[PDB]
Each structure stands twice: as C-alpha cells, then as structure tokens.
Design a protein around this ligand. Structure first.
Ligand code: PLM
Ligand code: PLM
Ligand code: PLM
Ligand code: PLM
Lengths: 386, 39, 102, 51, 51, 51
C-alpha cells in the first residue's frame, strides 16, 4: 500500500514565408492561405495562467476553422461535390467547437478540484523542504512527518490527473462518434435506410448503456463536486474507520484498521453519510463509569476536583473544558456518570488518541482508589428451610 | 440548543433526587431467596 | 435545430435522474428549509450541529466534533429535529423504589 | 403546523420536527383528538400459590 | 473462478458458492491478497485492583 | 517428466484467470456477426425499405 505500510522541425518560420509567397493578385488566395494559415493563428495567439496556457491551442483551432469556412462560403456534377465539401467544413467546425468546450470543462474540473481546496498544504510542504535543505548545510519524528505529507500530496495530485484523463477518454470517444454520425447525415451521405438503422441502434444503446452512463455521471459528481474526502484522509463509513488509499471514478479504495484493502463502489458511497477526521476540528471524548449510590456527595465533589487538576496539568493533551454529568439513579444502588473531555487533536492519528485516553482512564482508576470510591451489589436476604 | 447546559441542570436534579431518597429513607430491595440445604 | 433537439432528448433519457436529484435537493434547501447554520439538529437520533449548507450536501458536526457529510438526496426523506427553533424543552428522570415503600 | 411539503410536529419533550409529507403519507397515523374515550392496561403478576 | 455473469467462491469449509456478479457489483469487497501486512487485536480484562 | 507436469500446471494456472475474456469474445463475436449480416443486406441493396 501507499499508506499504512510498515531541418523540418523548426522550418515553420520559413514555411510561413513560402506560403505568403504563394499569391500576389487572386480569388483562391484565401484557399491557399489555409494551407499554412495555422502560422497566422499562432502569430495571433502570440499577440493575444493555467487556463491560458492550456486553452490557447484549442482556441486557435476553433477560430482557424471558422475563418476557413467563412472564406470558403465567400470563395464560390461539381455542383454536388461542392455541397458536400461545404458541409464537411461545417461539420469540422462543429467538431472543433465541441472540442473546445470539452477541453475547457475538463480544465476547469481538474484545476478547481485542488486549487480551491489544498493550495495551502502545498505551500507548507515547500516550506518544510526548504528548511530541510537549509538544515543540511523528536526531530526525526518531524522529519518523517514532512516526507509523509509530501507523499500524500503527490498521491492526491496523481490520482486527480488520472481521473481527469479517464474522463477525457470517455468524453473524447463519444465526441468522436457523434461527429461521425453528424457528418454522415448533414452531408447527405446517409440515406433513408441508413438513418433508420442508426436511429434504432441509438435507441437500443440508450437502454443498454443507460445505467452505465448514469452511474459514471453520479460518480463524477460525488468525486469532484461533493468531495467528502481526499487521499490519505481517515474517514468513517457506517462505523468503520478507514483510511482512503486511492480514488477513482468507479471505486474508492480504503484500508481498514487491520489494513484490509477494501474496494468500495462509488455508486454506494454516494448515498452514505461520510465522516472525515482529517478535516475535523479538535475532537472530544467520553469516559463512562458507575459508582455506588451511597457515595457521599462530597466524594463526588472531590472526584470532580481531582479530575480538573489532572486535566490542567496535561494541557498538551487536554483542553481545560470538561464536564461531569450525573445521569441516572438505578434502583438505589447505582449512579451512572459520564466524563466529557476535549482532546487537543483531531482523530486522524487514531493510535495517539487512544494512548492519551488510556492515560486518562488510568488516572480515573487512581482517583477512585485514593478517594475510596466503591461499587457494591445489592444485599440478598436468605431464608433457610432446614 | 446548548447541551452542556442542559446536562448541568439535569445533573443537579438527579443529585437532588439522590438526597431526597436518603433523607426520606427510600430504598429498593431484592426479593428474598429461600434455600433448602441437603448437606 | 432538429438534430440538437434530438440529442437533448437522449441526454434527458440518460441523465434525467441525476438532474432530478439535484432539483429535489434545491427544493429541500430553499423551500422546505428545516435548518440553518449553527442549529443543532437531530437526524436518526444523532444530535449534530450544522456547519455548512450547500446544494448537494449538508455538513454537520457530531457531539465529538467529527465532521460528517450528508447528501441532501438522503436528508430529503428523513424527519429532522431542530433544537434551535424549539420552545422550552422538557425532560424525564426515571427511577424505581421498593413495593413496600409507604 | 401543516404545509404542502412538510408537517411540523412537536415531540413529548417539545423538540420541533420537520417531517416530509412524501414519507408521512405512507405511514399509518393515529389521531388521539379524533378518538373516542380510550382504554388502558395494568399488567402485574402474583405468586402461583395465591388462593 | 471468474465468469461474466457469476463468481465462484470457496468458503472456509470449502463449500462452493455461486454469486451473481449483479449482486457483487453493489458490495464492498475486501481483498487480502492485495493487502499490506495486516494487524490484529487481543482483548482481555483484569481486576480493577490490579496495581 | 516433472518438468512437463509442472509446465502443464502453470499453463492451466495462467489460463484460469482468462476465462472471462474468452466468454466476452464469444459474446462480442455473436454481436459482430449479426452486425455484418445487416450490413450485407444494406450495402448490396438486397434489402428494401419496408422490411
Ligand atoms: C465503465 C466505463 C469505464 C469508466 C472510465 C474508465 C475507468 C475509470 C476509473 C475506474 C478504475 C479503473 C482503473 C483501475 C483498475 C485497477 O485497479 O487496476
Ligand atoms: C440540473 C443539474 C445540472 C448541473 C450539474 C452540476 C452539479 C450541480 C451544481 C453543484 C453546486 C455545488 C454543490 C456543493 C459542492 C460542495 O459541497 O462544496
Ligand atoms: C418543485 C416546486 C416546489 C414548490 C411548490 C410548493 C410550495 C411550498 C409548499 C409549502 C412548504 C414550504 C413552506 C414555506 C412557507 C410558506 O409559504 O408558508
Ligand atoms: C451470447 C449471449 C448469452 C447470454 C448470457 C450473457 C453472457 C455471455 C455468455 C458467457 C457465459 C457467462 C458465464 C456462465 C458460466 C459458464 O460459462 O460456465
């Protein structure tokens, strides 16, 4: 596991000049320009940071084609051949448009997923590594924590890139297919019988792949929009405290307290209430106990006072705020009580939580012995027959 | 809305009930058990 | 125009159910409006403080401050208690005494 | 209170509860207000040997 | 064995069990083979007066 | 003889994890054949439009 483990190449400038040289008069000059008009788009782009760098090339294609179609329209059985060509160009532009849309949406999703959530953890990681580099020119525990946190960020970053690439493949594939169909029908190539068969194929597919498409969509919303947890977070699902090992579109992989690896479908996880200790504020806890009904109220008062002193001597572990609650009188034999305390940590480090609680439980033991707090069973009257 | 406060007030009432039972000598006892001994 | 409309129909067929869910969540948040941020609510016996409200999810803190994310698509079908909006509340102390108590 | 989408109830300890009509309408609902005089039961036990 | 419609498993007592994949598709599945070294717990109790 | 018996055991151990693929192949092929029948009927013009 990742967590829990024990020459032509640069001839474009020249090519562009050669293309310009192609005409100096007349009507076909725009058509000729199209052959190397990409250079013009590149220059326009130069003339025109995450989105900018990632999208400029998609924009260039879109506008490039738009111009080619516009000049084509204004340029002019060759009669039917040209109708065909015109529509082919239109289809190509539609394709580029959709391409641009697709790219944009994935860039938004991919970026906002992390940029608006853990920017600050990245900066903390950089800081600590700068410090380690400087130092080189409980210390060891600190050093290990710094490396483990960096690894966690690397894993989150890689899983996001992967998930987005998977989305990219699904969308690209459907986009390509629909563009083929669009081309065939707008150009007039497909005939009535072909339209009928394509129509049927789509309808049938709509049923077959219906649940699949819905499931993927819901999984995307769960993972990227709701985002109840990240990689490495300790989460609670139906009472199971589990560490998130990996996130994917269809599944989330978790490690149980005993490090069993669990594959948990997102289509199920989407309907559950999910806890997240990593994202929690300092967490609290409870120690329940019972005392005899005859315990003097003064000993109850001494118990409260002794507990307060303990907690105040250990402020690295406990917040000063606590409550002692008397809850119930059972028969006239038992008083049920509970101690409510506040930890100075959240529970991402579960073992540390238990160690601190364990000491508090032993302190309670000690206080009861010193104050002579006891619990007795009710007496039983016996009658003897011979 | 404030649970800690609710419980503090309730705890005092529970301890008052304790006090009243002691002052009025109110008790609970288990049913007697008859034993036959065959040695 | 026809081709565009045709695909909207197909998309509806396939994703209409997720859109339905989002819409239902909108009605829960803005029309039913069972709670606000900072209120203590009771869901399935769990007394939780509302920390954040969103369209798709509600974030709550449990008594031990564990942060919990509930889909609104689930809260829409539950009965929700709200202590903030409640009038003065009552309580019970149960006990038992000997039969022979005068 | 009553509304179209949800009914609001108070429990015996007066917490206020929002209860969707979409779930409430599939439950059997008792109504004490509309009820006739109601009955009750005291259960108890005695020794077998009681004459 | 694995097939498209069903998965065949052996229980600890080697009973052969046939699961529809359509139901496994909705379950959380543990996999020991793929797991890192696993941990364990021994629970016990002692007298309160143990020093 | 041990070498050949071990070779056989290994070939089976490896082939046992590919049974789902073989099943998918049969399914895909059946679909593909049907698609080609339909294509033949249409591309040669033998089918008419009412049918
Ligand atoms: C259902 C159509 C495919 C869905 C999109 C591609 C896969 C999305 C990611 C899900 C996890 C699959 C890849 C990891 C498998 C593994 O554990 O080796
Ligand atoms: C009719 C549905 C179409 C829109 C599909 C996109 C998903 C709905 C809008 C998401 C709004 C943000 C939800 C809260 C996210 C958060 O928990 O921070
Ligand atoms: C999908 C549309 C839902 C809106 C139509 C129903 C109108 C609201 C019904 C009452 C429930 C909300 C209470 C609002 C307060 C009020 O106006 O009395
Ligand atoms: C060709 C369509 C048949 C309908 C059933 C769909 C699955 C294709 C057939 C592959 C076999 C599925 C597993 C059954 C167990 C076995 O083969 O022994």
């Amino acid at each position: 596991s990742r967590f829990g483990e024990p020459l032509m190449i640069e001839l474009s400038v020249f090519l562009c000049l050669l293309g310009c040289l192609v005409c100096s008069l007349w009507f076909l000059l725009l058509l000729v320009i199209f052959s190397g008009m990409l250079i013009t788009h590149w220059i326009v782009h130069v003339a025109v940071l995450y989105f900018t760098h990632g999208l400029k090339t998609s924009v260039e294609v879109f506008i490039w084609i738009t111009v080619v179609l516009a000049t084509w329209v204004m340029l002019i059985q060759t009669r039917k051949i040209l109708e065909f060509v015109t529509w082919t160009i239109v289809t190509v532009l539609i394709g580029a448009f959709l391409w641009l849309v697709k790219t944009t949406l994935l860039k938004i999703l991919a970026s906002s997923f992390h940029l608006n959530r853990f920017f600050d953890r990245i900066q903390e990681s950089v800081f600590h590594h700068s410090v380690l580099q400087t130092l080189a020119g409980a210390f060891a525990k600190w050093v290990v924590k710094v490396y483990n946190d960096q690894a966690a960020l690397k894993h989150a970053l890689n899983d996001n890139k992967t998930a987005v690439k998977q989305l990219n493949k699904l969308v690209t594939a459907i986009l390509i297919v629909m563009m083929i169909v669009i081309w065939l029908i707008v150009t007039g190539i497909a005939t009535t019988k072909l339209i009928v068969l394509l129509s049927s194929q789509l309808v049938v597919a709509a049923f077959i792949f219906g649940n699949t498409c819905k499931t993927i969509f819901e999984a995307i919303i769960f993972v990227f929009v709701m985002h109840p947890f990240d990689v490495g977070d300790r989460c609670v699902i139906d009472g199971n405290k589990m560490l998130v090992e990996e996130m994917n579109i269809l599944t989330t992989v978790f490690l149980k307290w005993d490090k069993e690896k669990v594959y948990y479908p997102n289509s199920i996880l989407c309907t559950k209430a999910i806890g997240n200790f990593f994202r929690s504020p300092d967490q609290g806890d409870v120690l329940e106990f019972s005392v005899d009904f005859t315990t003097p109220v003064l000993k109850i008062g001494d118990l409260k006072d002794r507990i307060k002193m303990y907690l105040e001597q250990n402020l690295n572990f406990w917040h000063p705020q606590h409550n002692m609650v008397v809850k119930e009188i059972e028969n006239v034999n038992k008083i049920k009580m509970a101690l409510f305390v506040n930890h100075t940590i959240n529970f991402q480090d579960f073992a540390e939580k238990n160690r601190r609680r364990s000491e508090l439980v032993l302190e309670l033991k000690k206080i009861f012995e010193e104050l002579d707090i006891k619990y007795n069973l009710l007496p039983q009257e016996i009658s003897i027959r011979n």
